[PDB]
Design a protein around this ligand. Structure first.
Ligand SMILES: O=P(O)(O)OC[C@@H]1O[C@@H](O)[C@H](O)[C@H](O)[C@H]1O
Ligand SMILES: O=P(O)(O)OC[C@@H]1O[C@@H](O)[C@H](O)[C@H](O)[C@H]1O
Ligand SMILES: O=P(O)(O)OC[C@@H]1O[C@@H](O)[C@H](O)[C@H](O)[C@H]1O
Lengths: 620, 620, 620
């Protein structure tokens, strides 16, 4: 389909690009995966002219960085001068899929120059940094060393090439500000993945999404003592040849907060080849989740397991940001509706959110051991029955069915039966809370009244611990378990881009998101009639909370009323949707951003035609 | 234990050895495996001075010979002269385990010189060859080219090394005779694996083993028109520095026929590493043979399969040489004895001997299909029963055993039951004979009256076709099937060395042989109280036929009366016996023969001390 | 969806139905499976009032019939009188999925009455039967005993119920003619699956489908001496309360040949549950077919196997009826087109048609053995390499890649390499023809020039033998092999209904049929835009041969030009199409036919409203 070499035929000649980011070869956040995935295609387009600028960490260099010698004499002399001037910079490869060249800068080896660098920064842009941040000083040092390295590289080259600088986050924006300050012949691109004040204002302040035009950012930066971070972020955003954002919602957020409309939007992608390794895997995962729910619900298995649906929500433990309260309230409403209608369907909800636990509870382990004992007894009895039937059937005689069970088989069956006796109800959580009184999820469940009762048609399972293949009760990784679920509900409120819903959708599981996330807006914009492809968008921007909850309840009820053939068709449609989120297509927006940057920086040599051409209308 | 480098520390210096044999890189007989196994250790001792002399075949060079360039200039010039004088000789490697150097001589490229070579051979030793043999002419040509190559190699070498020639069979004895005729400074070793007149005299003539001293070999060579072959064989045997045989029985045969006592006996060995890849394999093979006998004996399975013993005899279709008649008569006697004693044991006899068949019979395929259908029906019913039991047992209720079978399960069971109806008796052979009237095995079975009747305690299975893993009814190779059998009975009359009993014993299966084979004599001489190690020797030399049969019957009855613990102990003892038949130990006799040859050829440089030192007394 | 109990709510009361057919409990033709599949649902609707009338065979009663006692006294007395009057009739169950009640009539026990029955038949309808048919006499006897049994059952019942007779083929039409002759109060349904003269006229006569209105059936029945069979068939068709056919093409055939328009069309169905046991199975089958083609094409594997397509045609060996010549000519044309366009795609054609063979050819077995040896060598080397890499990697050292291969590994690789040497071309057929000179398929292949050459882009594989799981080279059943193929092409000319294309389509494999078959017309009528669902209809009725061939070539070329995503979507669409051909829906037409029959026979008690209501418009 649409490859990188479609329509951007451009004279690249002697051009070098720097992918400056604070997290390269240092796993801190989530856009680490974005850089790791984009590196392969970007380097394939760029050949050997792709560099990454980032801080040095002993752990990172020990685990995934292989030190090497730089291939050009210019890098040799620049590194020699850089080490001989009182700093410490190393060179090597990044041990990832693409294997790009990396320069690592040790911010701890330049503490002597912070006093003069702060003064120069103030004399250049009137930016001050308090002494107690311990993070902004690191950003300032990283920017100073980055701009000094760029200046030395351009100055010491016999022939000056076209250098492109690309920064990603406000810990690196000081470098962009400084390189623009010193009038270096460089093309600067600034891309933001999350507004700094967005996270601060969403928590505490109410109706942050209904008051964008009524926010005078200066004060809100003032009272939180994050004024200087916003100052450098906004300054770096302003003095950029091309300004870029990751999603539309963040685009409006930056426009109303950073006071600059982003020129191009660049969604985050991923490599679909590794995830693709498609119904056998889902069937196996569903069967083994059936095994798990049989283990947990021993002694209360009064509902058909062929008409049960599995819902799940995952991510970091943010009750409000992920909208778990909305999901819980809508689950209660759906339980009420199903109980009224007398339906045979059952909904089992999973909640994978980290919490502060110590060990498992006795009930879950007891149930799992009981299930294992029942399975073993059934296997032993069925093996004995099969052997007896085979031997009695070779002699051409009908099996006398009343004599295939003897004393010890009855003893084992009886032991199993008394093992499956229970008077209480299955627990709603599989661990022991250390803050059970202050837990919001459990408090909400208690308020809405879901205790896995016999009459309840909706079951709630809370699994705080990270999902691992070595777990005593769920020895499975995140990917395989997600593959088997029926639907993923993410009623998020504030999220610049949804990594988890993207992973769910690329997997081929129908998902529910909001118009309030980058993924939701991307899907809504790039396809028509999204409901047919297994994606349901919750309108949260132009609606109240009760409206958002009723709509989500209606979506869930509509999903629960679908027949098996309808679910199969919807699942096939969502299967044939993974290629929209791969870097093979999403990498073109970054390339267009680069072309804009070169056109702005060197209009004499480069000229760009503003082509914004780039699709899935319908299937029924 | 005993390695090659134990006690033969000898100054080898510049010595070259030629392993002349007609079959090298050309699979014809059985000692091909002997050479292939001995090559690795002999070359390891000899370094790069190990050569093989043999005829050229297009198929052999295409399948397992890689042509190469000879590593020494002497070989270069000898090959160049050899090709330039009117012959055609190539050089290369043998694609086997050891990878030894091979020289291949094309006997079809020297038909021009046969007229003069026959005259020279007659003028040298008065040996004539008739024109209609088509095999002795090839031997004469091979010997002439071999001796000419040796003479050219020794003559054209700047420094003359100590050359050792080793021949193996009368197709190569002409070379030994010629090299001794031309007084070449070579050490000649002649080893025979089978006397030529032994096979001719065993068939037809009676009591060949009771009249060795009353045989005037000249006439018996005369009437059969094999006089010249015996002449060259005996002449080559006489004019050898060291005369060697493969087994003791062949030693006496050569002494009373070739009129020369062999100096050293060299038994054939094999590499035990590949065979060793030890009760799991036997259990699996026994279970699958149980599956086969269940398939064959459908509708007549009235005997316990936990008390059944499996006997087998294999090899080429020689009724008298392998003594199958003795085995059949003794099986009839044992059936009579077991029927009298009212024992619950059952003996199933296998006969793996190639015959002239066309296809399988209908009965065996029908039985196998019936068994497969029964197995499939049992598996389906047992799966359904297990699933129903599991679901009914999760709810903590005892299985109502009278409702786990429904209409279609009863239908399938009934269909199987009417499928297992048979009025006739199982066939004694699994194929269709083209000479059923003239078959000796079937005639003997009919005479002794074993038709697999219900009252019969001994079952006979005849499997003419080669045992292959792709067979429709026995998809198994020889090794795995032999691993699972209980006992291997080989009442051989004439066999210089037993490859099949050796393979059976190295495998770890108790076996019965005779004092009339090389393997039997070897085992009897090298261990004390052989009965405890799972080997039973039948005394056939000093006894009549009726005596040999009664002794074999007694041996079989004693084996059948053993308990399970006794069988386990005997099997472990026979397991710990494989290292006696490996080239790691059996290769020392060849090395001693080489030392004798060098001592005889060049007494000035070499002197040997006649050490004949080389053990398993008992275990209960 | 649409079940049997949708809209036909009707007072059935005391009604009995007889499913008269000559093949019940006697496997002869193909509609045996139709009856076996329809029995379950028909008996479920009918309770215990479903009977089958058919001849007695010892083999059938021994293998799949369980004799039982009839549950009603009326059947007791009728059977007693029937046996006491000089005939021999038994009672029992049919050992099939539904388990319906069966009455079996021995036609060989009533040879005494044929003389009077022939005279009575002639005096009733002037129908004569020649003495040398040996099949029409059996039909006459079956009809006489059937009508006598029906008359005795209705006469001897204390209260007379509403009896329904259903016949299926002209071997049973005599019964319908006789019951209509004797004015029994019975509802008669006649259904034909194939016109008798259709098969006779398609062979020999030209343009049978362009001359229906110009055929005066009397003569063509006359010259072939099949006049009396057509006479009884047409007479039975005329004197039927309801006339039924299996397909539209047969409907027009009966209208223009039997001179009676069929009231209702009843397509044949099947149970989709057993076939459904869906991409994992196809992937496994495709991989193993890749294994097979690797084995067959050793030494000529110069084409990519990831861009190869597998076509297949199967059925009985009818060159003209199945249109194999058209397929071969179009394959040649497509090979020409692909060779011109320089495409990388390759087409491998399979031909599963029984022939008169004796054994396999040497080349195929040699290739399979070579492939097995290569696979074994690769596995051994890869295991050794993995073990060495693991051990050398535990010590934290990079693998010295130049030392992981030693002498014996190189020897094995070399042996494999010389094993894969071949000078000739792969054979077009895997067996040895006994009539290679007179074989039409091979003659056509030779004429069109497809010898599996290197430059050829289309490969032809002919597999005459029945496909079995025990085959030496293709140990697979029909179902699993068909599951893995890419497309099934059936350019049939004369076929009343396509069992093989129906099995292919219900499996989920895109298929090509003609408007000239029952399946093709059914699909064309019941869906709109058939090309989107993976079915391509060849217009053969209104077109010449060259037109039919060009259209098929265009269809194949269009299929070959599809991308992988297009193929996946088409395959999912054809997956979601199996429920159209199940008896859960196709069984309603038979039920409507029954209601028509009861309305015609007893208008006083029953009245039917002519509802002909019964759908898949499109997806893209
Ligand atoms: O999760 P479900 O709604 O039960 O669907 C799971 C379905 O099970 C089986 O019918 C097949 O494996 C289908 O391929 C799969 O889609
Ligand atoms: O524990 P070890 O001394 O290594 O002995 C373990 C031996 O390994 C292999 O040789 C065989 O499986 C033996 O049956 C087993 O006894
Ligand atoms: O036969 P093909 O055109 O190669 O399609 C086979 C395809 O292979 C893999 O991509 C998947 O298993 C698909 O589910 C399957 O459809």
């Amino acid at each position: 389909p649409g490859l990188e070499d479609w329509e951007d035929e451009f004279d690249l000649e002697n051009a070098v690009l720097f992918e400056v980011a604070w997290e390269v070869a240092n796993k801190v956040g989530g856009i680490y995966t974005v850089l790791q995935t984009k590196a392969k295609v970007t380097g394939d387009e760029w050949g050997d002219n792709y560099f990454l600028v980032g801080p040095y960490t002993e752990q990172g260099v020990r685990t995934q960085v292989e030190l090497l010698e730089a291939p050009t004499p210019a890098l040799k002399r620049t590194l020699d001068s850089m080490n001989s001037k009182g700093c410490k910079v190393y060179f090597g490869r990044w041990l990832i899929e693409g294997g790009p060249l990396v320069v690592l800068l040790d911010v701890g080896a330049s503490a002597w120059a912070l006093e003069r660098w702060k003064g120069e920064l103030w004399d250049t842009c009137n930016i001050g940094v308090p002494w107690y941040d311990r993070e902004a000083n690191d950003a300032v040092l990283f920017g100073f060393l980055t701009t000094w390295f760029l200046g030395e590289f351009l100055a010491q080259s016999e022939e000056k090439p076209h250098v492109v600088a690309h920064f990603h986050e406000w810990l690196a924006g000081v470098g962009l500000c400084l390189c623009r300050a010193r009038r270096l012949p460089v093309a600067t691109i600034f891309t933001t993945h999350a507004t700094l004040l967005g996270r601060y204002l969403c928590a505490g302040a109410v109706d942050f999404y209904n008051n964008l035009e009524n926010f005078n950012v200066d004060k809100e930066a003032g009272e939180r003592q994050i004024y200087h971070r916003y100052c450098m972020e906004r300054a770096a955003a302003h003095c950029a040849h091309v300004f870029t954002t990751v999603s539309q919602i963040t685009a409006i957020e930056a426009q109303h907060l950073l006071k600059r409309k982003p020129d191009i939007v660049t969604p985050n992608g991923l490599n679909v080849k590794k995830f693709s390794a498609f119904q056998n895997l889902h069937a196996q995962s569903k069967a083994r989740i059936q095994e798990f729910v049989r283990g947990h619900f021993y002694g209360h298995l009064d509902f058909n397991l062929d008409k049960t649906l599995y819902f799940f929500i995952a991510g970091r433990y943010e009750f409000s940001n992920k909208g778990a309260d909305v999901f819980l309230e809508a689950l209660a409403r759906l339980n009420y509706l199903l109980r009224v209608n007398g339906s045979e369907q059952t909904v089992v909800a999973f909640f994978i959110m980290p919490a502060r636990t110590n060990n498992f509870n006795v009930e879950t382990l007891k149930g799992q051991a009981v299930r294992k004992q029942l399975w073993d007894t059934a296997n032993t009895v069925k093996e004995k029955f099969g052997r007896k039937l085979y031997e009695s059937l070779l002699v051409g005689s009908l099996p006398d069915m009343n004599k295939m069970l003897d004393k010890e088989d009855f003893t084992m069956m009886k032991r199993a039966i008394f093992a499956t006796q229970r008077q209480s109800f299955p627990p709603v959580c599989t661990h022991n809370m250390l803050d059970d009184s202050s837990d919001p999820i459990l408090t909400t469940i208690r308020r809405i009244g879901l205790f896995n009762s016999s009459a309840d048609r909706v079951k709630v399972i809370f699994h705080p611990e990270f999902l691992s293949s070595t777990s005593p009760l769920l020895p499975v990784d995140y990917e395989e378990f997600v593959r088997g679920c029926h639907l993923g509900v993410f009623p998020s409120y504030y999220e610049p881009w949804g990594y988890t819903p993207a992973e769910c959708t690329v997997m081929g599981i129908p998902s529910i998101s909001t118009n309030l996330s980058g993924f939701g807006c991307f899907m809504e914009e790039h396809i028509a009639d999204p409901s047919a492809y297994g994606i349901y968008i919750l309108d949260r921007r132009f609606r109240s909370l009760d409206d958002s909850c009723s709509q989500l309840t209606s979506f869930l009820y509509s999903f629960c009323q679908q027949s098996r053939r309808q679910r199969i068709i919807q699942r096939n449609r969502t299967e044939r949707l993974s290629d929209l989120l791969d870097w093979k297509y999403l990498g073109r927006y970054y390339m267009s951003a680069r072309h804009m940057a070169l056109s702005k920086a060197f209009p004499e040599h480069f000229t760009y035609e503003p082509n914004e051409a780039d699709p899935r209308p319908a299937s029924v």
